[PDB]
Tab-separated table of all heavy atoms in Angstrom:
chain	number	residue	atom	x	y	z
Q	32	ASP	N	46.828	-77.142	7.676
Q	32	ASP	CA	46.487	-78.138	8.695
Q	32	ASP	C	45.873	-77.439	9.907
Q	32	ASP	O	46.553	-76.816	10.724
Q	32	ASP	CB	47.718	-78.946	9.079
Q	32	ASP	CG	48.494	-79.429	7.874
Q	32	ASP	OD1	47.855	-79.877	6.896
Q	32	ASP	OD2	49.740	-79.354	7.892
Q	41	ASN	N	38.692	-69.511	32.051
Q	41	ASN	CA	37.622	-68.707	32.630
Q	41	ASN	C	37.367	-67.517	31.721
Q	41	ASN	O	38.314	-66.867	31.272
Q	41	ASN	CB	37.984	-68.232	34.042
Q	41	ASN	CG	36.780	-67.744	34.819
Q	41	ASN	OD1	36.259	-66.661	34.560
Q	41	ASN	ND2	36.333	-68.544	35.778
Q	43	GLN	N	35.096	-63.918	31.123
Q	43	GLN	CA	34.345	-62.849	31.758
Q	43	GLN	C	34.233	-61.687	30.788
Q	43	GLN	O	35.055	-61.549	29.876
Q	43	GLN	CB	35.023	-62.381	33.053
Q	43	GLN	CG	35.308	-63.487	34.049
Q	43	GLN	CD	36.133	-63.007	35.223
Q	43	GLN	OE1	36.339	-61.808	35.400
Q	43	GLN	NE2	36.610	-63.943	36.034
Q	48	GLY	N	36.869	-48.590	29.227
Q	48	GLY	CA	36.755	-47.574	28.193
Q	48	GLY	C	35.539	-47.782	27.316
Q	48	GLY	O	34.433	-48.056	27.800
Q	55	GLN	N	24.422	-53.772	20.587
Q	55	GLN	CA	23.747	-53.680	19.302
Q	55	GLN	C	24.137	-52.380	18.611
Q	55	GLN	O	24.110	-51.307	19.220
Q	55	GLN	CB	22.232	-53.760	19.511
Q	55	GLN	CG	21.375	-53.285	18.348
Q	55	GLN	CD	19.930	-53.087	18.753
Q	55	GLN	OE1	19.317	-53.966	19.357
Q	55	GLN	NE2	19.378	-51.924	18.430
Q	61	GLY	N	21.625	-52.171	8.321
Q	61	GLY	CA	20.878	-53.069	9.179
Q	61	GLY	C	21.312	-53.004	10.628
Q	61	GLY	O	21.406	-51.917	11.205
Q	79	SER	N	48.647	-63.517	16.115
Q	79	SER	CA	49.397	-63.404	14.872
Q	79	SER	C	50.738	-62.734	15.128
Q	79	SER	O	50.844	-61.821	15.952
Q	79	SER	CB	48.605	-62.606	13.836
Q	79	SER	OG	47.348	-63.207	13.581
Q	122	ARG	N	34.306	-62.725	15.870
Q	122	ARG	CA	34.581	-62.529	14.454
Q	122	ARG	C	33.332	-62.028	13.738
Q	122	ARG	O	32.220	-62.491	14.009
Q	122	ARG	CB	35.069	-63.830	13.823
Q	122	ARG	CG	36.571	-64.031	13.918
Q	122	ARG	CD	37.009	-65.321	13.248
Q	122	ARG	NE	38.389	-65.250	12.779
Q	122	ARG	CZ	38.920	-66.066	11.880
Q	122	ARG	NH1	38.215	-67.037	11.324
Q	122	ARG	NH2	40.192	-65.903	11.529
Side-chain angles (χ1 to χ4, degrees):
Chain Q
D32 313 318
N41 196 286
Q43 306 173 10
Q55 163 194 310
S79 302
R122 272 181 153 198

